[PDB]
Design a protein around this ligand. Sequence first.
Ligand SMILES: NC(=O)c1ccc[n+]([C@@H]2O[C@H](COP(=O)([O-])OP(=O)(O)OC[C@H]3O[C@@H](n4cnc5c(N)ncnc54)[C@H](OP(=O)(O)O)[C@@H]3O)[C@@H](O)[C@H]2O)c1
Ligand SMILES: COc1ccc(-c2cc3nc(N)nc(N)c3cc2C)cc1OC
Length: 157
Amino acid sequence: TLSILVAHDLQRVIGFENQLPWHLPNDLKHVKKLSTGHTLVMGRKTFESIGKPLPNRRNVVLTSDTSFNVEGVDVIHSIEDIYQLPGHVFIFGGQTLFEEMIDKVDDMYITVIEGKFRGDTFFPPYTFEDWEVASSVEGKLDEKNTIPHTFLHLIRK
Ligand SMILES: NC(=O)c1ccc[n+]([C@@H]2O[C@H](COP(=O)([O-])OP(=O)(O)OC[C@H]3O[C@@H](n4cnc5c(N)ncnc54)[C@H](OP(=O)(O)O)[C@@H]3O)[C@@H](O)[C@H]2O)c1
Ligand SMILES: COc1ccc(-c2cc3nc(N)nc(N)c3cc2C)cc1OC
């Protein structure tokens, strides 16, 4: 299975200055729950933003840099390499990866951040004409999680 995993706001903002624009611990818990024991494929900028591979899953980085050889990270140099990866593969970002993969993935796990942030990177437009809502679950708000959010699982029709 090839899936997208993304958090985007009401206007599809995903990033600002190589970070996520919002602080939302519950979204990280969601990422942990979904991708632990599986595979993340991410662009080089996303990797450098996190600085180290996420524990307890295979971290795969897509880059043209042939000098890229980082401990605990597997490197790939082509989109085509993604299709050779075993098991459940999550396309993890950033903008460039999402743009390249949205027409290719089986499904998408989207955290809709129900606010409007300043962004410099975006998830590409998509329409519910193409995507069945397998589930939609409102995130719980508390002291540590103060921005409304909804977890969507969309499956290509
Ligand atoms: N909200 C979210 O769900 C989410 C998730 C992840 C990231 N983000 C955000 O997204 C933003 C970064 O996105 P971005 O588009 O600027 O960068 P990115 O997608 O993380 O990485 C771009 C880099 O990936 C490599 N790459 C992509 N396609 C390639 C290909 N076909 N062949 C070889 N290399 C390829 C290139 O690396 P080289 O230049 O080294 O060749 C390229 O410069 C940040 O703000 C980050 O915080 C948001
Ligand atoms: C505060 O640190 C972090 C903040 C945000 C993220 C982060 C959250 C994410 N959330 C979702 N739904 N999807 C992604 N593809 C995603 C990617 C990253 C990189 C990851 C972080 O650390 C690994």
